[PDB]
Amino acid sequence: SFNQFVDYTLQDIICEDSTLILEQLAQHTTESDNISRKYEISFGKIYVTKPMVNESDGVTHALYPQEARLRNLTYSSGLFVDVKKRTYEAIDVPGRELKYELIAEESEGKVFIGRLPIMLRSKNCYLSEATESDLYKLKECPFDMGGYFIINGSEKVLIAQERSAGNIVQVFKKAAPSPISHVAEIRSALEKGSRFISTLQVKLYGREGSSARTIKATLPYIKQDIPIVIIFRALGIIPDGEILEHICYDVNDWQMLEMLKPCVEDGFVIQDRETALDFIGRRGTALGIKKEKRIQYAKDILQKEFLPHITQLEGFESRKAFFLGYMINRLLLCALDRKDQDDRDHFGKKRLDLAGPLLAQLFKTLFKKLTKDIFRYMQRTVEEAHDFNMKLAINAKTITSGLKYALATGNWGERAGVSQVLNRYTYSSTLSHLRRTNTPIGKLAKPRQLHNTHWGLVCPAETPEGQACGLVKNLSLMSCISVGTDPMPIITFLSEWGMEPLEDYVPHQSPDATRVFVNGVWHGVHRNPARLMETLRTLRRKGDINPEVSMIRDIREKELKIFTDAGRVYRPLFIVEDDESLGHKELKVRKGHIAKLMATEYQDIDVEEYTWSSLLNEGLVEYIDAEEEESILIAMQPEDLEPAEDVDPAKRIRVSHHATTFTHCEIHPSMILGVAASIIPFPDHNQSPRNTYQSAMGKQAMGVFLTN
């Protein structure tokens, strides 16, 4: 996560608010001063130094973590960005449109913007390239794994923060006293933009015994809950048949149409797109719009604020309308009891914010504040006619103190307990702390209980016994968190392999079409999803698609979901193929691959290096998260459950499951445990609270935490 944040996310944050334009009006009392000046400061490429420290007397030298721990320094490195100053001027002729030109003062020029704390053993740290003898020379323990920050000489670990996944439609049954029976909400969030969270709630009024059960949705920046038909007509879908086609995908599902009948009756008197937009414009919360501009205000709200995770550009009203219809369809499916309400505790519906995303959002806030200060100083200099000093414009202490304060104290802002002092009682205690996850807690769910989806991702018995029981979780041994990839290549690939776009999709002519979702965004439909899923799986198993990408085919409700976002917890699994030579399902990994692995391992203690990525690229293993785990069948043991079927009475009773359609096999079942639970001898012979007590108490033992 830290390497992703340093290598890619920093430039993305810089390029999001790169250009800072200041326009100076002529303010001309006489026509002799009819010139308007346009000053632009633009941030370019960002540079990072090796970790280093500047002392009192101004000398800057390389800082190593041993010195930074001893001298109570911060193991940080400098950030430098390229700034090009643009000066545009134009003749201020009233009525005539201004055409600016450069005065050739395009000065450019690395400028120091702050110190980013460097997590140890990351790509920027000195200890990444260090050998064992180099680590001994630097008085660093070779057993030390890194993974932490040094802030003021304290080893700070960033606890992974668990949050609900974004861009997922979740339908919730409200309480009996509430007039709203069901609520379908989506926490619509975007990654390549302002990172603002806009929640669209589609709500179904009236209880089951009631008759006037209408559906009203909570658009952002709107004081009232607009009926869904008015929103559909405001999106350009006037007739009732097209609206019901967008919502109900089966013409024979008359019960869904019967529940939609009060909704179309409610917004019956609005029959035009402009009337619907002006109706939305009446309820605008800004309250500064004149009589005639409410149409454009409603269009602007529907474009830049209504479901921003799909698009922010114009001309995408059809996709937003189809997604709104999909939300209403899911809401009515739960309302008709065809599907249960969404499980809040499903671990596939969760994301874990590691050091990467946490430092990313913190640096986004700090850099927005820094750009605001740059513009404020620049406006002061151009208004009060003082000379512009480049060094006073960028206050590097802003970014430096923000990162240092949010890492030294756990308060993630300007959420507590994000950064904790790293445990150093034993080695296993440090390992357990570096894989610890935290779930902030006031909802109606049950997050403290161990869920089914927690299999192989978090430890079944490793949690504190106090008030943090179940809220604080520890990763299993093989579990990994995805760092996130760009969904644009996958979306481009899908549209060139038969995915019909959502603009020219009609559900009644394509009743068997499978909806295609990429990162929670409905991008279109596919007529033949089976061979598409086969193509996608063959690309991922050969490494063409990044192995962290999770692709889920839900055959029952005809959905193909692809997730490329960060924060997904996955685990490796063996691949079980058809294997027509043996006539039965078998693991793709064979004894030759195992021999290559042991040959590489014993060479490390001259043949080709056969690494874990060699298994990953040859399709022998695969990365499965909790969403994809819902659509696969896993065998616990290869040699016991793959081949088709006197027993030792001392052995435990095993079931063969009487089913040979396996798609995956567990690598080893002992890998469902975390660091502290893997110390326990025979944990399967113990009562589970005793395993939890030992996992808590293994961190309080005495050993040799580090050799240095």
Binding site: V421, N423, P464, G466, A696, M697, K699, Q700
Partner: peptide
């Protein structure tokens, strides 16, 4: 300060539970 995982119950400290339900 201290950092211990052995949970010691804070006695005489029901005000956390009193403040959880202040209205009836």
């Amino acid at each position: 300060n201290e950092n211990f995982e052995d949970f010691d119950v804070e006695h005489f400290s029901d005000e956390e539970t009193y403040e959880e339900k202040p209205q009836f």
